[PDB]
Amino acid sequence: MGRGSMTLAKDIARDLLDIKAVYLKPEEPFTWIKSPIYTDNRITLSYPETRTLIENGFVETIKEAFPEVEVIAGTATAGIPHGAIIADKMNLPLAYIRSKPKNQIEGRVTKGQKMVIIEDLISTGGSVLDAVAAAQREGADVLGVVAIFTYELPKATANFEKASVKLVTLSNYSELIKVAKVQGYIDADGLTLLKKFKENQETWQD
């Protein structure tokens, strides 16, 4: 329900900040509009230790939230790598869902097969929600979605609520920024600026 172990969220957030999968710059934001946070979880694939922490994290939270799972599907293309390793560890069939046809489901999925979709980052959620929709159109019984990280944007919760799809994440914005402060990546000011950004990606610098 929402995430996995409180300690997994903490450890992963720690790792994301250390290897620089997540950058925090409250004082000099990047551009979209202006954002104090930037994330590329594809970086985690280059650090075996962190990668293993994340993939084991996936396997564990899947067993808790979606134990009935029969097929692991990765979201093209940032989610595929994680999904592959996950499927290997759990010795389950792997499939992957494309942005659009070249029939977006690659691999072999039988009608009704229970599927968990893997995503690396949840921002608005639109990408994975489209992957979910496509899988459902092709016959899959999508138990839900599991992602490495989420910005906890209200929009995302709204999109997921409306589509009725269950989402679980290894770590989250709230816990990451709390850890960021403790670990010295940001100061008091930065922390409040980051909280502001989550509540409104427009008036946080005001």
Q: Does 46 bind a copy of itself (CB under 8 A)?
A: yes
Site for a copy of itself in 54-83 (CB under 8 A): 55, 71, 74, 76-78, 80-83
Among 25, 38, 45, 181, binds a copy of itself (CB under 8 A): 45
- Count of residues interacting with a copy of itself (CB under 8 A): 33
The residue to which tokens 């900040």 are assigned: 17
Contact 53, 88 (CB under 8 A): no
Candidates 30-38, 100-108, 153-161, 188-196; binding stretch for a copy of itself (CB under 8 A): 100-108
Q: Which is closer to a copy of itself, CB of 97 or CB of 193?
A: 97
From first CA to last CA, the distance across the chain in angstroms is 34
CB 20 within 8 A of CB 13: no
Contact residues toward a copy of itself (CB under 8 A) are 42-43, 45-48, 51-52, 55, 71, 74, 76-78, 80-85, 87-89, 91-96, 106-109
